[PDB]
Amino acid sequence: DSFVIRGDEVRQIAPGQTGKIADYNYKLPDDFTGCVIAWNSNNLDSKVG
Amino acid sequence: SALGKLQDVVNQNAQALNTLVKQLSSNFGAISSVLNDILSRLDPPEAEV
Amino acid sequence: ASVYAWNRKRISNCVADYSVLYNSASFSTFKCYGVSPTKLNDLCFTNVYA
């Protein structure tokens, strides 16, 4: 499951979290198994304008 | 004290029941001894604990 | 106030909508310890202090 979020919102991609994108964008179950992967993409997903 | 042998058995059984009822008032290290308080205060990841 | 002289305000005799605290994205940290954040609208309190 691939998406792009902010830098402070990476703590919300986790089981048992309270948060904003956890509730209204992307929810993980309490019995979730797997790995969450995050890396900075300021060189690709950003524009000066 | 003529009938002390029967009264001893009755008192032991009633005291065991009273101890078993009294043990519900202990939280055993949890935040509360009432299940409804935990279920109304906490999210299921920590209410599970 | 500064942290050595932190200001304590009493909160009493009010109905509190904590959903405007949960739904605001302005807070960097919104972390509750003895209570779930979403259950705050369902409970009654006293000795509320900010």
Curated annotation (Swiss-Prot), chain C:
Effect of S26P: In strain: Omicron/BA.1, Omicron/BA.2, Omicron/BA.2.12.1, Omicron/BA.2.75, Omicron/BA.4, Omicron/BA.5, Omicron/BQ.1.1, Omicron/XBB.1.5, Omicron/EG.5.1
Assembly with partners or alone: Binds to host ACE2. RBD also interacts with the N-linked glycan on 'Asn-90' of ACE2. Cleavage of S generates a polybasic C-terminal sequence on S1 that binds to host Neuropilin-1 (NRP1) and Neuropilin-2 (NRP2) receptors. Interacts with host integrin alpha-5/beta-1 (ITGA5:ITGB1) and with ACE2 in complex with integrin alpha-5/beta-1 (ITGA5:ITGB1). May interact via cytoplasmic c-terminus with M protein. May interact (via N-terminus) with host bilirubin and biliverdin, thereby preventing antibody binding to the SARS-CoV-2 spike NTD via an allosteric mechanism.
Function, in words: Attaches the virion to the cell membrane by interacting with host receptor, initiating the infection. The major receptor is host ACE2. When S2/S2' has been cleaved, binding to the receptor triggers direct fusion at the cell membrane. When S2/S2' has not been cleaved, binding to the receptor results in internalization of the virus by endocytosis using host TFRC and GRM2 and leading to fusion of the virion membrane with the host endosomal membrane. Alternatively, may use NRP1/NRP2 and integrin as entry receptors.
Identification of the protein by name: Spike protein S1
UniProt lineage: Viruses, Riboviria, Orthornavirae, Pisuviricota, Pisoniviricetes
Gene: S
Boundaries of the shown chain within the full protein: 348 to 397 of 1273
